[PDB]
Structure formats: structure tokens, C-alpha cells
Amino acid sequence: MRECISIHVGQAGVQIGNACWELYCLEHGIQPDGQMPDSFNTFFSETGAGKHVPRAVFVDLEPTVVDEVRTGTYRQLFHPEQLITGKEDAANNYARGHYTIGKEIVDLVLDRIRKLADLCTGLQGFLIFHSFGGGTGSGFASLLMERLSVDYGKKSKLEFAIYPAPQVSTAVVEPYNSILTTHTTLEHSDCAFMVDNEAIYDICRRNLDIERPTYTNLNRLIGQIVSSITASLRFDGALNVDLTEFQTNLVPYPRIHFPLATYAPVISAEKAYHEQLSVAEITNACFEPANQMVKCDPRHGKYMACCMLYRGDVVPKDVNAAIATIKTKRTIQFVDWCPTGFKVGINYQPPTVVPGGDLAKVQRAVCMLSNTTAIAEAWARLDHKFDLMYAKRAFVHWYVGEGMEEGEFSEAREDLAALEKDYEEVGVDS
Amino acid sequence: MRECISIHVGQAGVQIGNACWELYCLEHGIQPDGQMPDSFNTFFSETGAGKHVPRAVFVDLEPTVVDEVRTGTYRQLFHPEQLITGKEDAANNYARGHYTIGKEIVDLVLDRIRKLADLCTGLQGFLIFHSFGGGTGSGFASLLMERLSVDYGKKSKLEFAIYPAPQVSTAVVEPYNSILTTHTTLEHSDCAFMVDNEAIYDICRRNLDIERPTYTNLNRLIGQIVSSITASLRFDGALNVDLTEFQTNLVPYPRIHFPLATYAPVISAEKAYHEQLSVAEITNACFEPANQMVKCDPRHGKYMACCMLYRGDVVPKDVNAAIATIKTKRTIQFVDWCPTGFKVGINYQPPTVVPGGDLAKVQRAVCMLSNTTAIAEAWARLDHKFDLMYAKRAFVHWYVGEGMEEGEFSEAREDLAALEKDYEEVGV
Amino acid sequence: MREIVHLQAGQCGNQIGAKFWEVISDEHGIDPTGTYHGDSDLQLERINVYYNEATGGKYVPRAVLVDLEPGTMDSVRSGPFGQIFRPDNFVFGQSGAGNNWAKGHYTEGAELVDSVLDVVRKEAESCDCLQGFQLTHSLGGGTGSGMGTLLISKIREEYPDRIMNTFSVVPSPKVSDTVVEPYNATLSVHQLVENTDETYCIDNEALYDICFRTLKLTTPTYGDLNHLVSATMSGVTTCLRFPGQLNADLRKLAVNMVPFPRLHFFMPGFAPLTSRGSQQYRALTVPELTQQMFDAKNMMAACDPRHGRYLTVAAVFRGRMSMKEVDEQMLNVQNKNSSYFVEWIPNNVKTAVCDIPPRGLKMSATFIGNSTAIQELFKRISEQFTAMFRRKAFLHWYTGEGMDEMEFTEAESNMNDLVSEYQQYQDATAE
Amino acid sequence: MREIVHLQAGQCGNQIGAKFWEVISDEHGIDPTGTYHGDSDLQLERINVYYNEATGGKYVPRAVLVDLEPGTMDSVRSGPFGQIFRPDNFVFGQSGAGNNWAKGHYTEGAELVDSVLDVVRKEAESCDCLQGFQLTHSLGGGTGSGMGTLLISKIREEYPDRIMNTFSVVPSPKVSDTVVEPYNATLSVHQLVENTDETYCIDNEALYDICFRTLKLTTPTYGDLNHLVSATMSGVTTCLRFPGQLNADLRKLAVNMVPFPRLHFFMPGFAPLTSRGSQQYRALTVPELTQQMFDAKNMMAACDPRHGRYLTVAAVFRGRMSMKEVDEQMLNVQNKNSSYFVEWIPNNVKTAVCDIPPRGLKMSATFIGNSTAIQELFKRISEQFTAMFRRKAFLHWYTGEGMDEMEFTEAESNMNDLVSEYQQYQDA
Amino acid sequence: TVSQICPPPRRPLTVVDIRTGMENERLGVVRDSMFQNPLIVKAELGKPRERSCSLPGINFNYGLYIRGLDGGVPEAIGHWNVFKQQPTCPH
């Protein structure tokens, strides 16, 4: 049946996977050992002893990020060999993780992917978590999925990844990795969920009242969205939507696979005590520019495709009531060649909440996946800051010292100039 | 169903809304938590666990005024995001609230009403309180009516405001704010109810025997007046009157939309014990110049239109008789082109009385909305006061320093001058 | 057979229709569930004029309750006979006219006339042979005085042959609750004169005078005035509903009543108005009935018939009597008040008798008069309207609806011509 | 005798057919175990039409369920009448089409058509004299709008004489949940025009409107929409399974409303649809049914016969009545609305009556109408299809399946031809 | 709000709850109203600000819930309401 395997790359993917596989196990009721005191058959597989093992591979070139998971509360839940570590990391260098350090453990990771794929009968797709910033999350993530394309030509590979924020930044040589990572996500990727950390900070400070949030709070929200897309896979629904159908109704041309995610209602129970939360209300929250997960203005770019993922105590009629208003809104724009740009998804069970978490439980919820042309301006922002560092050849000697030919720095930039000009073509209306 | 949305502007709007929404809560039966232990549907909106959030926005530019309400008794009743605050105020500068400080929070107010307008099915009118003295209550109140007019082209907006008193004043630079605010209340409003505190000062002392009243004692009177306007909409009556109905029979020309309110009986418990009340007596007091809450004598002018909102145990037979007596009086005059100048309204539910308040429980009441030409002379003292300020250029550098060009001061005065001559065209 | 469908326009006409359905439900013995608990076969021999049959022996009024404000329908349902009405029959808008005639006629009325028309066509096509429609409304509002005239014109074009009556309430100048009331009356009377088979003018001030003096009620609510008006329509249609020694109906009255198509405005009269002094018995005869009838105190109009010439008079009697003394009294008043009647029309009185008495009583009689007195009302309305209109006062509300200024001019021209030919018909001379 | 196979395709088709077999089992008195607990003898005389006989007085449905995604099979299995079916008749794939028309028609459909045809062939040869087949599918999917067209083409050459019936679901312009929906429809309708005796255009949006307006349902689910469809298609065979005042079947109708082979597109209707509040009033009578026969808010279609001419009309009646008024309400409705009926065909209406009323109800009927208004739906789709195809948007998915470019051009040409002659028959 | 949910509705914090080491822990004289009042409440590390007013039971708050007593279309369309008249008591 439907199965998805986790190929979480990087420290960010390991931390998110810690948050995700927590939210996964309490969603079904899996004890920390891994015993139920077949909806799990998308994410867990049985053994001879009646134990459910996650379909995940946590891979890093530094041991400590995985070592704490080995000493975490879920040490015995996981299969130890799926926790793959490395002696030395790329140290925020794209060239180190791609040509020098990545190739040492390519065979071990791919063989693990083969064994987990051999466990499944019908594989729907792969979900991959990494970042554009870290060397492990950028260079090594690029090579494995270049090889995964030729190993599995038809199998789907979604790409949820972390975007360098427009203002705040953790590292300095991040944009060199980002410019050198974005080529792989073009010719070898089916959909991209590039999000920046800075967007989570604002919604956590406004909606959830958290004036002092940390990555546990950011990662819970990410896991909920991933819980939302796979909810129709895990459970029944009036309109159950798998990965393939919503894959088709976002991608007009093979080059454009960059939708924007949005979740609602994300509201602290202090606000939710006296607040009416209805279906017509929450979809308006999905359309909020301040609630967008990517730091761009929705009004700058018109919409080509939208995905609606309702979940909980919802009915089609108020969904029909909700959508009919959204079309009668002037300043919200749509492309001329898409008169109908929605994909309605309805599920039964409301989302679960973790103890010690942030989100107030709501009987209903909605996830929004919007492909708009406003996102391309964020790449342009990346293109400027890469220009004023490459002109005087800053930090180039590190990548060259690894064995990388400096012309690829030029070609990767021309990829985005051609990529952004294609987003402009969609914006032109005949 | 009917709906009225509250956009209280300034410190005056916050404290008035404190008096109003308290009286509103007791009028329906709303506990301070906000739960009934659909007449309420015109002012409250149902929520999840059975609460009724008041359909109001509380906005200001100095944080502390709203902060007391957030720590008040009705703190859980209201919506914290409905309570809109600001870091810095205008400090009685019209230009600051119009061009410098207001523009930071222009968008925030328009997002709160976006929440409210989604809740409403059919909204009947827009209720706004402010004052003509304070900077935030004048300049910021001016720009929202500019944006509301283009957002809500067809909608009704009423203008409850505090007109600065003729003799006493809590500010010096207030007439500059007052003169520059007339352009908005002339072109971006449908009905305007300028009331000065000084006349309410006399009425509270003269009739209610309270020698030392506070700001809350004036505000309860204001909330009672607004309660009288909407009482037709909230509950059934023999002649239920909508906002659109009395707006029609009040405004002879689009420029003339400044009626004068009048509430009666306003009497203490000791005084009302010896005074039996009937329809004939309560209306007679409403045309007493001593009971007008605007410092002008309608006997010096001529009425063109009068809306008439009864409330309580009233019978139309006594209504027709009372109008018959008033029409037969040389002291009460009317314009030559309005043979019938009345808009009769009857309600069943009597006005309620707030605990710890001032008004005694009376089985019947009377509300009057008189549009006369006598309100014009109240402006005539403002231009005189404004002229002797502006001729020698007093306090101008404060407004110009904000970025406002000095030519608008002459234009706004010329605007207010044109309103006075238009009042004379009615007088002929 | 002979069926009447009732349009219920405005708040005034809404309550009017409510009380009318109550009183004739009492007349036909209908419980508020909608079944029958009465005793006589003449009580249900001819009900189906006003009622429609439903399964389980249920009967529903043939009414359409139309309003621009859904507040009144809640009170209608909260009323006693509230559940007797068909749920689909009520037609209401969401925004009212605000007592603005242009808003009611053009701005918001175009949005509701379609549903009003299709409901009314359903009701008309349900019955086999329709006689005519009855519309209840006032001339001082925004909905009944507004879009009601649009309904009138539309159903005039649709059914020309079926008769049309309007139980119209006309505003009074002495007591008025609306300032734009002359404007509404001016723009409604022009529609009424062009498209109406017959009009009954009801004056609320006259009803108040009647309840003050003839009935001496301490506390007149609107229920009493509405009960009087409902008794008036009941007396109009009782000859149709029940057999009499001399039968008649609405067409019988109208054809004999209307001398020229321009003139169709009539003053009604209702005879047994008894106060507590006269609450002793009904031991009375056609003399006493006629003396109570012909006094202008007992009239419910706004115009003294002695100031004009009675063009035509009609009287319908409810109960069983002998026609001899009835004819003697009519000839008596005709010979007595020679100047008050027109000379060119001998025998100015039409008479009818319905044997069935009204319920709760055993004698009643109604009267429909066309006299020259009604010209006093149009001229007075014109005097108010001219003063309103000369200085363009209260005109921006109408002009913002998108209408031109010539419409008021042609309306007042129509009324001036109407009162001019009315004065000519008063001062007809020679032979 | 007269047997029908209930071929079932797609999630829309699988759910709609699942609610059918619940409904018609109740009409014949069949438990979810499968036995016969019915009382009347006439309840079990013609059950061999839809049901194959099984041991112990059991009646397995003559239905075969097709879907690329095996997830929906678990849902219908877990339903109320889930174990009633024969799991030898579920034929399902492992990978879905993902709402891609080209994937179903060529890529993945070729591997599963053989097993479906084997089960259909087994059911076709099981009964001696088939009346035909029956398909329920949606035009906005990948399975029902995909291989369902392929199954039609294979069956038509296999069984040409046999009547096939399809109650297809047409996507709505106002409410759409698929972006590539105009692409799937325009390529599927071309399979419909070539090989189809009879088609019905059922629109989910009009299901929404009836639930909003007629039934006044606060929360209608998808089961309510299918239950209405469960009433509609059951009425077209009630004259078949049951004797009537005037007997009829699929062939007696299907000959009557097909003037030319190209036009088989109709708007179904259902008589006694009211909300609970309306039930207290009204009278049980056939004129009310006739008012519901041609009722405005009755029919399923997303189009309005004000804008076209009724070519043919059919009305099959359920229950015991008298014949007369049925033919008179027939006759008058032709006379007054004369322009809305075509002039070249006298007696545009056809009727049938079945004696047995539906379960729990005394009176019912079904409406079958051919009007020019169905052309409103087609030119809507071309407006959506041409805009998407002008920029070659969403083309690589279909192009990746190995299909050409000219298939789009010929499909739209056939519809442009189809609406041209359809418009021509309006103006004749 | 007390009746909402069998576990007690979420409440303003208390000085027993302030325990030792949280950021809203300071010396001097301590009253519950100081930590209750939002103006002088001290925010925590990665936690939502505590409620100044008592908030309902955590199990169910719900934006809006209604199941509808329409009756269901199978029941409505099968059992079309045949008119039923009440057998009134003897008078």
C-alpha cells in the first residue's frame, strides 16, 4: 500500500525528524518502545517481534547531532543502522560535501535506501528534508538525489528545504552553497518547499504569543504541515488526496515546482478561547501575507495554482461557501490561463497536538500549498548578494581548494537568471 | 440581521465605550465573562464556546487609556486584538494624527474591521465616537473616514462627537484641530451629533441634583442616548425605526446633517417621587432651551426637521395629542417649506438603569433629534476664536513642522464659512 | 371559481393583512393549526375564495407577504395566527428603502419583484378562474408605497382583465410621522391613477377620531384600527363569500360604481360602531343603521362629504332583513339630501344584501362612496408637495437613485389635471 | 430476461454505486447479509434484473468495480452494505492516474482492462438476455474519466446491439477541484459522442444548490448528494423492475428522445423534494408533482432551459394514481410555454407510470428532458480548455505519456462541430 | 468557564507554581496579582504567556460546532410527512 520513506539530510533534517517522528508516533498511539498498547503502514513497518520501525534514514557527516538521538527517549524506537553518521563534515562547504566527503558514505546511504525500499511493496514517494545553508544539507544532499533519479526514475521526490532568510543569517558562505545547490532541485525535483526560518519567527511571536521561541517550536509547525499532506494517505476522507493528484495540479511546466506552504489555524489558546474559528475564517488566514511561510509579498505575484488541504470536522458545503467568496476578490489575482486553480482536500480526523507543544487543538484545520510567481523575487535577492561577493572572488579559494572548477559558479548563476525569466513569462498575460 | 460596528476614537471613545458596552451588557443580560446565564445580534457576535464578543474596536495612540480596560472588569469579555493601541500620540496636534503617527496604524484598524465585517451578514450602520479637541481624536478620526468612504461607498456612518465647550476648555490649541476637522464631518459623514460637555454639566447639576459629577456621569447619559437610537433595532416596537428611516427625514440638503439630540426625563429619584410623568410633560421638557445639550437657543432659529423616539409605556393616542399641543405654540417655530416636521417612533422595552448610576427608573422616556438652524451660531464663535489665533500666527510652527502646508488653514476656515451661509439659506 | 389573492406590502399593510386573515379565519371557523372546527355548512361552502387546500384537511390563506425589511416577518410569525401562512409565501429583501420612494421603486425593488411575481403567478395559476387581486399598503412608506406600485404595473400588464383593488392608507397632514411623505404620496398617486381598478382611501387620523369619539376607547392600539379596517374588507367581500337575497360582488360594485376610468378613489363606512352606552343590545332597524352610516363622524376618510357632491353611493348589508325599509331609507336620504347628490345621475345609490351575519354580531353594514370630497385631499397633498419641492429640499436622496427631475413635474401635472376634471364633474351644469 | 450490469469506475463512481446498491436493496427487502426478508410477493419477482441469485435466497449485485487506487476499495468494503458484493468482481490497480487523463487511457489502463473485461464477460454470459450495461463515473477524474472511456470503446465493439447507459458527472465552472479538469473532460467527451446511446449531465454544484435551497440542509455531506442520485437513476428502471399503468423500459425511452445519433445529453429530475418545514403544509397531489416535474429548482443540470428550446421531454411516474390529469398537466404545459418547445416535433413530452410507489413514500417520479440549454455547458468548457491549451500549459504530463499533439485539436473540433449542429437545430 | 471540561479550566499561575528558577521569579514581596497582571508579567523561555484570566478546559474549546437536526435526506425523502392530527382530549 502507500508508503513514504524519510531521507532527512543535515542537522536541520535530524532535528525536524526528531520533531516529526514524535508527532507521528503520538498521532497513532505508538509507545516509545514502538509497541501498540493499518494506518501505520505508511510510516511504520512490522517485525517478527511485533515492533513498528520508522521508515527513516537520519544521515549526517557529524556524529553529535545523531548521537543525541541515540541517547534520546526514542533510542530503541529507531533502527541503529538507519542512523548513519560521518567522521568529518563539510564545514558549511558545498564542494566538501559534494566531491570529497560525500562520496565516502554514498554506498552505505543508498544501500540503506535500497533495503527500506525493498521492505515496501508499492512506493508512492520520498520526502527529503535539508537546508540550502549547511554543507551537509546542500552538497551531500545534491549528490544522493542525483543518484536517486537514475535508481528510481518514476518514484516521486518532494523537496522540503530551508531557505536562507532575507535579513537574518547563521553563516556567511551560505549563498555560495545556495547558488550551487539550486541546480539539482530543478532538473531532478518534482516539488520544492523552500521556506525561510524568519517567517516562523513572526507568526510564532504574533499568533502563538511566544515572544521567545526556539527551533522546537519551529520544527513542530513544520511537522504539522508534513502531517497535513500525508493525512489523506494515513486516514480515510470524503475527498482523499494522495501525492500524485496534487502533484499534477500545481506544475504547469516542468521548470516551475516551487509552491508556498501555509497552515491554519495556528493560534494560541489564549486567543482561541473567545474567538470564532470557522471554515470561512481560516481560509482567509491562509491567504494572509503575514501568515505566508516565505518572505515575499503575495500581491507582487499572481497565482497560477492553489492546493487546499482541509482536515477535521469540515463539510464540503462550507468549503464550497468558502471558495466562492475567494473568487469574488478583486485585488487577489490569478493568471489568465487558469480559470480554476484549486484542488480541494477533505479529511475526517482533526490534527493531533503534542504535550509541551505550542498549538492549541482545533476541531478543524487547513493546509494551503500555493504556486505563485511572487516567490521568484526571493531568488533575485539571492542573486544580488551572490553577485557582490563573486565579483571580488571572496571565499572562492575554499571551493577551488576542494577540486571545484570556478566556471560552475558562473553557470549556476545563469541557471537562476534563466529560471527567474521563466517566472516572468508566466506573469505576462496575453 | 441588523448590525452596528463601533469604531471608538480617542480617550473619549474608550471611556464612552466603557459606559456604553457596560450598559449594553446589562441591557441584554451579558455577564462580564460574556455568557448568557436574538436581540443581542445587533451588537454581539456569537463565538465558539457560547460567548458574545462585543462588535467594537477600541483604538487610541497613548497605550495607558486602553490598558485600564484590559485590566478592567470586562477584560475577558472584549477581544485583545479589538483593543488597538499606539506607542505615541498626537498631543492635540491635528497634523500629527493625520500625516505622521496615524499612517503607521492606518492598516491595523482596517484589518480589525475586516474580521468584524466577515462576522456580519447585513451591517446596518457605522457608529463612531471621537472628539474635536484631542489630536488623535481629530486627525486620525479624519483619515479613517477618508478610507472608510471609499471602502464603504454606500454605507451609513454616524458622527457622535464632543464639540469643544464655548466657555470652558481642556485645551488651548483645540480650535486649530476643530477647524481642520470640519472638512471630514462635512463630506465624509451622514449624520453628526456635536455635543459639548458644558451643557451636560448644567443638566446634571440642574436636574439630577449631583453637585460633583465625574466623566462617567456624562458618559452614562451618552450611552443612554445611543441606547435610545438602537432600541427600535434591538427589540420590537409599534413603530420600529431604522437608521435609514430617520436619516431620510432629517437631512434637507447634503451639507446639512448636524442634528441636535435631546433626552428626557433626566430626574433624580427624590425629584421623581413627587412628580407624576406623562407624555405631555416629557416632550415639553425636550423643547426647553435649558435641557438642550448644545449651547444654542433654538428659539433664536427655526426648526426644519425633528425626529422623535419614544420609549417605554407610551401610547400613540398620547403621541398624537402631544404633537397637537406643540404645533399650537408661537414659541416653537418651523421653516415655511416643512409643514410636517416629525418622525414618530415607539418602542415597547423601557430604558434600563445602571447600578451605581444617576437616572431613576421611569416607565417612559423621550428622545429628540432636532435639526435647527440655531446650531450655526455655535460655529460662529469658533471662527472668531480661530481668526484671532491665526491672524498673528499662533502655534502654527507645530503643524507646519509635521509637514502640513499653511494654505489649508485658510481653506478650512473658508469651508466652515460656507457652511454658515448655507445655514442662512435655510433661514430665509 | 372566484378566487382572490392578497398582496401584503409594507409594515402597515403587513399588519393589516395579518389582522384580516385572523378575522376571516374566525368567520370561516379555522383553527390556527389550519383545520376546521365549525358547525355550519355555509361556513365551509365557499371558503376557497381565500384559502387553498392542503393534505389532512388543512387550509392556508392565499397571501403573499412582501417587505424590504425582514423584521416584520418575525413579528408576523410571533403573532397568534402566524403558523397558518405558507413558508414559501413570504418574500422579503435584506435592505429597506428607508421610506424613500425612489429606492423602493427602482433601486431595491428590482431585486425582489422577480420573486414576488413568480410566487404570485404560482398562486394565480393554482386557482381555476381568478376574479382579482387585493393589495394592502400605505402611501407613506418606502416599500409599500414604493415597489408595490411596480407590482401593480407588472400584474396590470400580465393580467389586464382580472380586477384590482388597493386598500391604500393615505398620509394625513394634521398628524404625520414622515417628512418625505408628500414626496412618496406624489410619486405613488401617479401610479395609482394610471393602474388601479379601485382604491379605498383609509385615514389613520379618521380611525383615531372614530375610536376617540364614537367608540370612546381609552387606549387605542393599532390592533383596534386594524380590526376596523379588516371589518371593512370583510363587509366588502361577505356578499361574494355568502349567498344573499340580493347578491353582488366586487365587479358588481365597481362597474356600477366607476363613472369614468380616472376616478376610482372611494371612502368606506362601517355602520354598527357602538360604544359602552350602545353596548346594551342590537335592537335596532335600518333607520338607525342608516343614520349611523350617513354621519360624517362615522366615516373613515380625510374629507367631509358635505363639502362636495356625492357622485355615487353603495351599501352592502350583512345579516337578514327585509329590503322594503332598506329601499325606503335609501330613497329617504336621496330625497332629503338633494344638493349633496349629483343631478345627472338619478338613483345614486346601489344596494346589496348578504343574509349571513358577521361573526360575533348579528347586524352589520358597509358603505362605499365616491364623492367630490376626495378632491380636498389631493389638493392638500399638492400644497405640501409644492412647498417641499420649490426649494429642492430633500431631493438629493431621490436624485442619487439615478432619476430625473421631470418625474415629479409630470406627477403633479397628472394630479392637477385629475383635480381639475374632478372640479368640472362637481360643477356639471344644465341638462 | 432483461438484465443490467452495473459497471463501476472511479472514486466518484464507486461511492455513487455503493449508495445505489444500498437503496435498491431496501426497495427489494434485502439485508446486508444478502437474504430476502421482504413481505410482498411483488418485492421479489424481478430481482434477477440487477441481482444474480446466490445460495440461501441471496442476491449478489451485478456490478463490477474499477479503480486504479485500491484505497477506495477498503472504504466501500467497510460500508454498511459492504460484504454484499462479490470480491471476485473488484478489479483494481496499484497506481493511480493522478487526475491525468492520458495516464489512464493509455499508460496504466491497458494493464487492467483485460481483467475488467473478463469479469464483465463472465457476467454478460451469466444471464441469457441482457438489456445492457450501466456506468457511473465523473468527467473530472483519472479513472472514471480515463479508462472508463476505454472500457466503453471495447464493450461497444463487443456488444453493439446492447444499450449502454452512463450517468456521468460533469465538472462545474463555478466550483472546480481539479486544475487539469478541462483537459480530461475535452478528451473524454470525444469518447462519449462516438460511442454512447444515452448520457446524463449531473453537476455537483446543482446538488449543492438544492441542498442549500430545497432541502435547507445545514450540513449536507456527499452521501446526501449520492442518495439523491440514488433516487434519480432508480426511477428510470422502476417501470422495468415493476409493472405499471403504462409499462416502459430503457429501450422504449431511448428510442423516443434521440432524434439524431449525436445528441444524447440530458438533464435529470426528481419529483417530491422538499425540506422538513415544507412538509407540514402542501397537499399530496399529482399537480404538485407536475409543478415539481418541470420545477425550476428540480433538475440536476448546470444550465437553464430559459436559454434554449426543449427538444424532447420524458416523465416516468412512480406510484398508483389516475391517468387523466397526468396527460393534462402534460398537455397544458406544452401549450403555454410554446416557444420553449421545438415546433418541428409535435407532442414533445412522453410519459410512463409504474404502480408501485417508492419505499416509505406514496408518490414519486423522474424527469428526463432534452433541451438546447445543455449547449451552455459545452461552450463553457471550451472557454476553459482553449485558454489552457493556447500557451501549452500543463501539457508535458500528457505529452510524457507518448500521445501526440493533434488529439487535442480533433477533440475540440468534434465539440465545435457538436455545438454547431446543436445550435443549428435550435434555429430551424 | 469553570464547567468547561472535567479537568480544571486553565488558570492564572500561582506562587506555588512559580517554584524556583523560572524567569518570573524575583525577590521582594510577591503577590499573585503581580504575575497575573499582563503589564508586569514577565515572559518565559519558549513558552506562551500564561493567561491573565482563567481560560476554559484544554480538551475542547472549538471554533464552532453544530451537527444539524435536519433529519437526513433518506428519512426526509422516504418519509415525506403525511399529515398527522392530534387526538385532543375530551372536553
Ligand SMILES: Nc1nc2c(ncn2[C@@H]2O[C@H](COP(=O)(O)OP(=O)(O)OP(=O)(O)O)[C@@H](O)[C@H]2O)c(=O)[nH]1
Ligand atoms: N528551522 C531550523 N533550521 C535549522 C535547524 N538546525 C539547523 N538549521 C538550519 O541549517 C543550516 C545549517 O545547516 P545545519 O542543519 O546546521 O547542518 P547540516 O545541514 O548538517 O550541514 P553542515 O553544517 O555542513 O553539517 C542553518 O542555516 C539553519 O538555518 C533547526 O533546528 N531548525
Ligand SMILES: Nc1nc2c(ncn2[C@@H]2O[C@H](COP(=O)(O)OP(=O)(O)OP(=O)(O)O)[C@@H](O)[C@H]2O)c(=O)[nH]1
Ligand atoms: N464627554 C467626554 N469627553 C471626553 C472624555 N475624554 C476625553 N474627552 C474629550 O477629548 C478631548 C481630548 O482628547 P482625548 O479623548 O483625551 O484623547 P484623544 O481623543 O486620543 O486625543 P489626544 O489626547 O490628542 O491623543 C478633551 O477635550 C475632551 O473634551 C470623556 O470621558 N467624556
Ligand SMILES: Nc1nc2c(ncn2[C@@H]2O[C@H](COP(=O)(O)OP(=O)(O)O)[C@@H](O)[C@H]2O)c(=O)[nH]1
Ligand atoms: N392604520 C394603521 N397604520 C399603520 C399601522 N402600522 C403602521 N402604520 C402606518 O405605516 C406607516 C409606516 O409604514 P412603513 O413601515 O414605512 O411601510 P413600508 O416602508 O412600506 O414597509 C406609518 O406612517 C403608519 O401610519 C397599523 O397597524 N395601522
Ligand SMILES: Nc1nc2c(ncn2[C@@H]2O[C@H](COP(=O)(O)OP(=O)(O)O)[C@@H](O)[C@H]2O)c(=O)[nH]1
Ligand atoms: N457527486 C459526487 N461527486 C464525487 C463523489 N466522489 C468524488 N466526486 C467528484 O470526483 C472528482 C474526483 O474524482 P476522482 O477521484 O479523481 O475520480 P477517478 O479518477 O475516476 O477515481 C471530484 O471533483 C469530486 O467532486 C461522489 O460521491 N459524488
Ligand SMILES: [Mg+2]
Ligand atoms: Mg552541520
Ligand SMILES: [Mg+2]
Ligand atoms: Mg488622547
